[PDB]
Design a protein around this nucleic acid. Structure first.
Length: 48
RNA sequence: GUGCUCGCUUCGGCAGCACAUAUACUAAAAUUGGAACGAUACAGAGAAGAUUAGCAUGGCCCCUGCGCAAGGAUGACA
């Protein structure tokens, strides 16, 4: 992600690269955000 | 069918008369065909650059060598 910070990327490529911090934050707090206490509703299993 | 004709005619009947005027995708049944993104089976990183190593070229500035052209200043008695 650091090496790609300056490599002449298109706007759509950079927009899809400023999401890694959000993905890492969501994964760090995943045992709390994905809880079924928060987000009441049906649960879905990843098929692997 | 109902009721009526001063009709034939008998109450057993007959001839005529008024009203009735055109429903239905019509259908109960006939058959043989073509068929999932529903399951199981497979795969499943389901969103990234699709790369980095040398050398040479190209630009600028010196230094050295060779060539071409045009030149400058200087040196040498018997």
């Amino acid at each position: 992600e650091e090496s790609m910070k300056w490599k002449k990327l298109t706007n759509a490529q950079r927009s899809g690269l400023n999401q890694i911090p959000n993905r890492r934050f969501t994964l760090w707090w995943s045992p709390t955000i994905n809880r079924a206490n928060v987000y009441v509703g049906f649960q879905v299993q990843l098929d692997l």
